[PDB]
Design a protein around this ligand. Sequence first.
Ligand SMILES: Cc1nc(Nc2ncc(C(=O)Nc3c(C)cccc3Cl)s2)cc(N2CCN(CCO)CC2)n1
Length: 260
Amino acid sequence: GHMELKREEITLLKELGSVVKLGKWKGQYDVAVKMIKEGSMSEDEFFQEAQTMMKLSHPKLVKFYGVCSKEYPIYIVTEYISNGCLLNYLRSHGKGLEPSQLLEMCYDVCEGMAFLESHQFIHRDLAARNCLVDRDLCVKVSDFGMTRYVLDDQYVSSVGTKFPVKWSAPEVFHYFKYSSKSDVWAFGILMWEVFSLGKMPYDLYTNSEVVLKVSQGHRLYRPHLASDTIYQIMYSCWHELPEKRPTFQQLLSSIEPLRE
Ligand SMILES: Cc1nc(Nc2ncc(C(=O)Nc3c(C)cccc3Cl)s2)cc(N2CCN(CCO)CC2)n1
């Protein structure tokens, strides 16, 4: 098999986030190394989560390299994505970007998402916070411990980790279910985060308020940087009925003419 890496071939350099560290693998490759402490998660859950991330390999998804599981802390090793978190990037440097570059960020996410959709997986927390920006401003989605298998046009129970409600499809908070399109709703919110340069969606409202207002028909306003056509694409993601929302394949073909 091939998932286990030689721990001695990884030099830990600096803390990236909280714990993820920057490292050098074999004196040649830049890596990001997530530290799993004993008790933070079950070893069975860790193994399943690593195997799934490995399997869902795609240029627009974070590239899993391997694990170091012979002792604690357990390592999950991935590629090192230079520009960090998309949310921080939008907030720090967004103002300088061209609107075509913001649209390109949405296209990257949509491409990675159409891949997950092709394998009947959904991302349970599709948000800027779970996206990483490379040197060229290309976006990669992190799927680690966040995916769920759901048959096309079906529903499954929401039982598991509860993710922020402001990115959740109504079926999630109304019916305690995910649909194969719960993912698509969150993609619209991600698009809104991109075009608003990282503003908090539904800023002035609580989770209980959002749940109620969304149920009433309230949707996020158009960020000024987004064209009318782009806003119409994000809006289409927010249909109350999953069956009325587009697929990531349809979204990809809608985003493409607008220059990818
Ligand atoms: C927090 C952070 N991440 C960075 N890069 C990463 N690449 C891959 C990462 C990672 O977490 N992989 C991973 C995933 C996704 C799932 C499971 C397991 C793992 Cl291991 S984190 C860079 C960075 N920067 C700080 C701000 N600097 C601005 C200077 O201009 C840029 C550098 N900060």
